[PDB]
Amino acid sequence: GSSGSSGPSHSLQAPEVRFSKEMECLQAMGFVNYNANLQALIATDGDTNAAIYKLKSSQGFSGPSSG
Incomplete structure (x- = not known):
């Protein structure tokens, strides 16, 4: 709706609002799972x-990445 501000x-x-800066960092990593x-x-x-x-830890469809 409104970018930033x-x-x-x-x-x-709101929660995500509090831990938003994180939710964004997570995404970057690939952790799109928001609700999660x-x-x-x-x-x-x-x-x-x-x-x-x-x-x-959680192993229920997220993103298998190893190496």
Whole structure:
């Protein structure tokens, strides 16, 4: 809808909004799974590393990449 633009957080704000900067970083990596990342984030209270560690762990159609 509106690219960027976001004021301060008064109280009780969206999750993805809070961990947005992350959701974006995740995507870059390839973690498009939003509904997942989002939850994962909330599960890590805003933590990419963990978020990743968790996501990665999860083995249910995401993106098989090894080497």
